[PDB]
Amino acid sequence: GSVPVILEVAGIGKYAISIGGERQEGLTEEMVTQLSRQEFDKDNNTLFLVGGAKEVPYEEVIKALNLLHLAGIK
Amino acid sequence: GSVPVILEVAGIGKYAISIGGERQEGLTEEMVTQLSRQEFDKDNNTLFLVGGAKEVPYEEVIKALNLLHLAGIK
């Protein structure tokens, strides 16, 4: 493959997403869902990975993973 | 940066890790910890991200994230 789908937890409610090499910053939770869902519906074998920064609480990372599960990403 | 630290959940107990462009496959949980800890102690600003495959249960992804937290990765 070229480059997976990457979701980054920049803080509290702010996220960044890397789609096949292209990076998008300043995304919201509702918007991150929209994009994640659209990319997964077009490609079913898209490797999904989630990472958080050192300043983000682990509980928020769980929530992020939770949101992805809710939209059927993982 | 060049390329973050990526940990992939290939299944049940099998993991893959990508360190600055170099990918290692067939790693165990105890070994993944060793590597993750060594990379984090050398670089404190290393972006850490975790992703699981479509065939892996979400509960295992939580466990993986849990293991990283235990060794102070996130």
Short mmCIF file of C-alpha atoms in Angstrom, two decimals:
data_model
loop_
_atom_site.label_atom_id
_atom_site.label_comp_id
_atom_site.label_asym_id
_atom_site.label_seq_id
_atom_site.Cartn_x
_atom_site.Cartn_y
_atom_site.Cartn_z
CA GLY A 1 0.00 0.00 0.00
CA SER A 2 0.89 3.69 -0.22
CA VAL A 3 -0.01 5.27 3.13
CA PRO A 4 -2.70 4.12 5.71
CA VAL A 5 -5.35 6.29 7.37
CA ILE A 6 -3.95 8.05 10.44
CA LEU A 7 -5.93 9.92 13.11
CA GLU A 8 -4.04 12.07 15.62
CA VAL A 9 -5.31 13.46 18.94
CA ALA A 10 -3.75 16.93 19.13
CA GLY A 11 -5.47 17.81 22.41
CA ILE A 12 -8.99 18.14 23.78
CA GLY A 13 -11.38 17.99 20.84
CA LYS A 14 -8.78 18.83 18.16
CA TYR A 15 -7.68 16.17 15.68
CA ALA A 16 -5.49 15.72 12.60
CA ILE A 17 -5.94 13.11 9.85
CA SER A 18 -3.49 11.74 7.28
CA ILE A 19 -5.11 10.19 4.24
CA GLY A 20 -2.75 8.44 1.81
CA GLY A 21 0.01 11.00 2.37
CA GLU A 22 -2.28 14.06 2.62
CA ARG A 23 -2.53 15.62 6.10
CA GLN A 24 -5.54 17.64 7.34
CA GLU A 25 -5.31 19.72 10.54
CA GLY A 26 -7.85 21.52 12.72
CA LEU A 27 -10.59 18.91 12.37
CA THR A 28 -13.53 18.49 14.76
CA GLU A 29 -14.94 15.24 16.16
CA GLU A 30 -18.06 15.31 13.95
CA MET A 31 -15.92 16.13 10.91
CA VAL A 32 -13.28 13.48 11.72
CA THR A 33 -16.11 10.93 11.76
CA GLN A 34 -17.41 12.07 8.36
CA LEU A 35 -13.96 11.73 6.77
CA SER A 36 -13.11 8.45 8.50
CA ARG A 37 -16.42 6.93 7.38
CA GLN A 38 -16.09 8.17 3.80
CA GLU A 39 -12.57 6.78 3.47
CA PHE A 40 -13.54 3.42 4.96
CA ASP A 41 -16.60 3.06 2.68
CA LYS A 42 -14.43 3.62 -0.41
CA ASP A 43 -11.62 1.32 0.78
CA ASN A 44 -12.48 -1.64 3.02
CA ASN A 45 -8.83 -2.72 3.50
CA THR A 46 -7.68 0.71 4.76
CA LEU A 47 -5.27 0.30 7.70
CA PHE A 48 -6.65 2.46 10.54
CA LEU A 49 -4.33 3.74 13.26
CA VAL A 50 -4.86 6.15 16.17
CA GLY A 51 -2.21 8.12 18.09
CA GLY A 52 -2.24 10.81 20.77
CA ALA A 53 0.21 13.49 21.87
CA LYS A 54 2.09 13.53 25.19
CA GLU A 55 -0.16 16.31 26.53
CA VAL A 56 -3.43 14.40 25.87
CA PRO A 57 -5.12 12.31 28.67
CA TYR A 58 -5.35 8.57 27.88
CA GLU A 59 -9.11 8.66 28.60
CA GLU A 60 -9.47 10.90 25.52
CA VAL A 61 -7.61 8.42 23.33
CA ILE A 62 -10.12 5.76 24.43
CA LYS A 63 -12.97 8.11 23.51
CA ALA A 64 -11.41 8.66 20.06
CA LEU A 65 -11.14 4.90 19.48
CA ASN A 66 -14.72 4.67 20.79
CA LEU A 67 -15.93 7.20 18.19
CA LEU A 68 -14.30 5.22 15.38
CA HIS A 69 -15.98 2.01 16.58
CA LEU A 70 -19.34 3.81 16.67
CA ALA A 71 -19.04 4.63 12.94
CA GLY A 72 -17.81 1.08 12.19
CA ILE A 73 -14.16 1.92 11.48
CA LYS A 74 -12.75 -0.65 13.92
CA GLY B 1 9.95 14.82 11.62
CA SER B 2 10.83 11.81 9.47
CA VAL B 3 8.48 8.98 10.50
CA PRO B 4 6.70 8.42 13.92
CA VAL B 5 6.61 5.20 15.96
CA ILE B 6 3.83 2.90 14.75
CA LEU B 7 2.53 -0.22 16.50
CA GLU B 8 0.20 -2.56 14.60
CA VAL B 9 -2.05 -5.29 16.02
CA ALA B 10 -1.83 -8.09 13.43
CA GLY B 11 -4.03 -10.48 15.42
CA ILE B 12 -4.03 -12.13 18.83
CA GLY B 13 -0.63 -11.60 20.40
CA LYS B 14 1.18 -10.75 17.14
CA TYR B 15 2.39 -7.20 16.50
CA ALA B 16 4.36 -5.16 13.98
CA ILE B 17 6.33 -1.95 14.67
CA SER B 18 7.52 0.80 12.34
CA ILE B 19 10.40 2.85 13.68
CA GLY B 20 11.39 5.89 11.60
CA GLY B 21 10.66 4.10 8.31
CA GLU B 22 11.97 0.66 9.41
CA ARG B 23 9.29 -2.03 9.86
CA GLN B 24 9.66 -5.05 12.17
CA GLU B 25 7.22 -8.00 11.96
CA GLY B 26 6.53 -11.03 14.14
CA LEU B 27 7.06 -9.27 17.47
CA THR B 28 5.71 -10.48 20.82
CA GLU B 29 4.05 -8.40 23.55
CA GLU B 30 7.09 -8.49 25.87
CA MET B 31 9.37 -7.62 22.96
CA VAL B 32 7.09 -4.84 21.65
CA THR B 33 7.30 -3.28 25.13
CA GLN B 34 11.12 -3.45 25.15
CA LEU B 35 11.36 -1.71 21.78
CA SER B 36 8.65 0.87 22.52
CA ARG B 37 10.34 1.78 25.82
CA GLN B 38 13.82 1.99 24.29
CA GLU B 39 12.62 4.27 21.49
CA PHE B 40 10.70 6.53 23.88
CA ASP B 41 13.67 6.86 26.28
CA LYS B 42 15.92 7.99 23.41
CA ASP B 43 13.34 10.37 21.91
CA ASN B 44 10.80 12.03 24.23
CA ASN B 45 8.90 13.77 21.39
CA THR B 46 8.28 10.54 19.43
CA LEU B 47 4.73 10.50 18.03
CA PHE B 48 3.15 7.21 19.18
CA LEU B 49 0.27 5.70 17.23
CA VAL B 50 -1.59 2.37 17.52
CA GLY B 51 -3.67 0.61 14.86
CA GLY B 52 -5.40 -2.76 14.55
CA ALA B 53 -6.49 -4.93 11.63
CA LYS B 54 -10.11 -5.64 10.64
CA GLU B 55 -9.87 -9.19 12.03
CA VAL B 56 -8.72 -8.08 15.52
CA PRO B 57 -11.27 -7.62 18.41
CA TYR B 58 -11.44 -4.03 19.75
CA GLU B 59 -10.87 -5.33 23.29
CA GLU B 60 -7.37 -6.37 22.16
CA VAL B 61 -6.62 -2.88 20.84
CA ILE B 62 -7.50 -1.52 24.29
CA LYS B 63 -5.13 -4.05 25.87
CA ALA B 64 -2.36 -2.93 23.49
CA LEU B 65 -2.90 0.72 24.42
CA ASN B 66 -3.00 -0.44 28.04
CA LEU B 67 0.42 -2.12 27.69
CA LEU B 68 1.94 1.06 26.27
CA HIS B 69 0.55 3.10 29.18
CA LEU B 70 2.02 0.58 31.63
CA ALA B 71 5.53 1.22 30.24
CA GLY B 72 4.90 5.00 30.18
CA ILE B 73 4.58 5.43 26.42
CA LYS B 74 1.23 7.26 26.57
#
